[PDB]
Amino acid sequence: TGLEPVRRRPGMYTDTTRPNHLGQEVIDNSVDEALAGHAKRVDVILHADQSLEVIDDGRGMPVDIHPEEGVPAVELILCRLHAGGKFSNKNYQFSGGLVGISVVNALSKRVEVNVRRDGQVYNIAFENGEKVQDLQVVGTCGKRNTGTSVHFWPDETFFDSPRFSVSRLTHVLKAKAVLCPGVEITFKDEINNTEQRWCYQ
Ligand SMILES: Nc1nc(-n2ccnc2)c2nc(-c3cccnc3)sc2n1
Ligand SMILES: [Mg+2]
């Protein structure tokens, strides 16, 4: 797959110290929904197995079939590597700017995406960068209840430590609530057994 280079050279796509930047890529997407005026709340969850889950009540990642590839948008998004999200020379390094949940995919033993759209609950799954589960309807919900959950398990062999840095995570989420006044951002640490909420009028 086109995600192959990311797994050969993870350091050229992410910070391989710890999986935090993976987390920040998913959060950025949910906060983009808030910025356009579609999500009001972003819930983040550090699970006890050191996986991260990021839920927003936005429109839902798009699930329409692109005709030329005959696959749902959400899959294109998760599988397509974007160029120029991170770059380097021996004097200068940049990242990321206006990147990709696809690097999260490439560097995860599992990813699960759930999308609430039009009263349907859609599900797609990935393992080691490869699709293990086709987009499918696994439940129903209210027509008003829309948005996206991304749940991912970082592959520890790509990082110096598989552990999320709690203080780096929490500052990011605080920073995002400041950037988007009125959005509610929550963090639930199933490890340290804490609950946190930020909202700025
Ligand atoms: N969390 C999230 N992330 C999205 N995304 C887009 C690209 N990478 C992540 C996203 N896209 C949405 C969308 C995109 C186009 C049309 N309608 C909705 S809602 C959404 N919600
Ligand atoms: Mg700050």
Swiss-Prot record:
Alphabetical GO biological process terms: chromosome organization; chromosome segregation; DNA topological change; plasmid partitioning; response to antibiotic; sister chromatid cohesion
Metal-binding as UniProt keyword: yes
UniProt GO cellular component terms: chromosome; cytosol; DNA topoisomerase type II (double strand cut, ATP-hydrolyzing) complex
GO function terms (MF aspect): ATP binding; DNA binding; DNA topoisomerase type II (double strand cut, ATP-hydrolyzing) activity; metal ion binding
Coiled coil region boundaries: none
Keyword entries, A-Z: Antibiotic resistance, ATP-binding, DNA-binding, Isomerase, Magnesium, Metal-binding, Nucleotide-binding, Topoisomerase
List of residues binding ATP: N29, D56, G97, L98, V99, G100, I101
Entry similarity comment: Belongs to the type II topoisomerase family. ParE type 1 subfamily.
Subunit composition and interactions: Heterotetramer composed of ParC and ParE.
Purpose of the protein: Topoisomerase IV is essential for chromosome segregation; it is the principal protein responsible for decatenating newly replicated chromosomes. It relaxes supercoiled DNA. MukB stimulates the relaxation activity of topoisomerase IV and also has a modest effect on decatenation.
Name of the protein this chain belongs to: DNA topoisomerase 4 subunit B
Species per Swiss-Prot/TrEMBL record: Escherichia coli (strain K12)
Lineage: Bacteria, Pseudomonadati, Pseudomonadota, Gammaproteobacteria, Enterobacterales
Parent-protein residues present: 14 to 216 of 630
